[PDB]
Paper text:
Phenylpyrazolo-pyrimidone compounds 34, 35, and 36, analogs of hit 13, engaged JAK2 JH2 domain with selectivity over JH1. The compounds that targeted JH2 domain shared a trifluoro-group as R1. Diaminotriazole analog 18, diaminotriazine compounds 4 and 24, and phenylpyrazolo-pyrimidone analogs 34 and 36 targeted JAK2 JH2 with selectivity over JH1, although the affinity of these compounds to JH2 domain was micromolar and thus lower compared to the JH1-targeting compounds 1 and 2. All compounds bind to the hinge via three hydrogen bonds (H-bonds) with the exception of 36, which makes only one hydrogen bond to the backbone amide nitrogen of Val629. Since the compound binding does not induce significant changes in the ATP pocket, we compared the regions around residue 617 and the helix Cα between WT and V617F structures. It has been noted before that compound binding to JAK2 JH2 V617F can disrupt the aromatic packing of F617-F595-F594 and the conformation of F595 and F594 can be reverted back to the JAK2 JH2 WT conformation. In structures complexed with 6, 36, and 16, a WT-like conformation for the phenylalanines was observed. In the complexes with 36 and 16, the switch towards the WT-like conformation seems to start from the shifting of Gln626 gatekeeper position, which in turn affects the conformation of Leu624. This leucine forces both Phe594 and Phe595 to a new conformation. It appears to be possible to affect the conformation of the V617F region with small molecules, especially ones disturbing the position of the gatekeeper.
JAK2, like other JAK family members, comprises a catalytically active C-terminal tyrosine kinase domain (JH1), a regulatory pseudokinase domain (JH2), and a Src homology-2 (SH2)-like domain that, together with the N-terminal FERM (N-terminal 4.1, ezrin, radixin, moesin) domain, forms the major receptor interaction moiety. The JH2 domain has a key role in mediating both negative and positive regulation of JAK kinase activity and numerous disease mutations locate in JH2, including the prevalent hyperactivating JAK2 V617F in MPN. Previous studies have demonstrated that JAK2 JH2 binds ATP and possesses regulatory autophosphorylation activity on Ser523 and Tyr570. To gain insights on the compound binding modes to JAK2 JH2 and to analyze whether any differences could be observed between binding to WT and V617F, we determined the crystal structures of selected small molecules with JAK2 JH2 WT and V617F.
Numbering used by the authors: 536 to 809
Write the structure that this text describes.
């Protein structure tokens, strides 16, 4: 069950972008906080499209399943608004936003050690999810959010959190899944019901490719039919320019799901690049 937040206590401000069948807004929540102090808290508001109310169950289940776990690398859910007839999630506002946009804007000021640290953090989150046998199912750089920048003065590294997967690929139209190649693994293009913990290992590889490519999108030049051929011919992504993690990427993006390494093994390999 989700906490109910009064429409009166929520103000919607700027549009930040779109998810699958969703609109994303920054907003403010008036709330009673610690010691009874009133706060006006920045929040991230996800609104399900009114034309896609058919997906409301999966929209809310995506956030609900992750809200029953607590972890430093997982975005906090605050509740739902209900907001009349609207379907709205209220979650933590992460100051610097999506990692994919951040990587692009700061491509020249981000070295391999920065990318390694963020990769280790993501793998930590995914290992926590694996230990809890919780499938995410939509790991990608768009869904990783940067809480804090590197601060060389105090030696603080960047710090990320993983947001919820949104509507599940087990219910999305096939065309959307094909557009999501190569984050959606080949067995899920074959059948979305093959969604498995092994799915997230494959998607983690694709996300690491994003992190190493300064925010490029793999296979973006390929339309959906060519993305299908990419899997039919069993291709692998090119090594990123920052090729230090190329081997780890391809080992995660194993066409055999049962052979993808555990996130424990992934974390050990990330720690071994030294
Ligand atoms: O907390 C935030 C904070 C910001 C954000 C956006 C712009 C500037 C600073 C922060 N942007 C997002 C998004 C987002 C927004 C548009 C497209 C993809 C992701 C998510 C979501 F949860 F949706 F992943 N949270 N978030």
């Amino acid at each position: 069950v989700f906490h109910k937040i009064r429409n009166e206590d929520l103000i919607f401000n700027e549009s930040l972008g779109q998810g699958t069948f969703t609109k994303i807004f920054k907003g403010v929540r008036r709330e009673v906080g610690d010691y009874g102090q009133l706060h006006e808290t920045e929040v991230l508001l996800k609104v399900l499209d009114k034309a896609h109310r058919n997906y409301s169950e999966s929209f809310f289940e995506a956030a609900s399943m992750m809200s029953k776990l607590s972890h430093k690398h997982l975005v906090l859910n605050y509740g739902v608004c209900f907001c009349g007839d609207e379907n709205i999630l209220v979650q933590e506002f992460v100051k610097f936003g999506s990692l994919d946009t951040y990587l692009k804007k700061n491509k020249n000021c981000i070295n391999i050690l920065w990318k390694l640290e963020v990769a280790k953090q993501l793998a930590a989150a995914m290992h926590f999810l694996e230990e809890n046998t919780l499938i995410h199912g939509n790991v990608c750089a768009k869904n990783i959010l940067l809480i804090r920048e590197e601060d060389r003065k105090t030696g603080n590294p960047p710090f990320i959190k993983l947001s919820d997967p949104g509507i599940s690929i087990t219910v999305l139209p096939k065309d959307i899944l094909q557009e999501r190649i190569p984050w959606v693994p080949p067995e899920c293009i074959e059948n979305p019901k093959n969604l498995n913990l092994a799915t997230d290992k494959w998607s983690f590889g694709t996300t690491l490719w994003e992190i190493c490519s300064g925010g490029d999108k793999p296979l973006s030049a390929l339309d959906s039919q060519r993305k299908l051929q990419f899997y039919e011919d069993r291709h692998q992504l090119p090594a990123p320019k920052a090729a230090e993690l190329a081997n780890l990427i391809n080992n995660c993006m194993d066409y055999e799901p049962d052979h993808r390494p555990s996130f424990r093994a992934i974390i050990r390999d990330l720690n071994s690049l030294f």
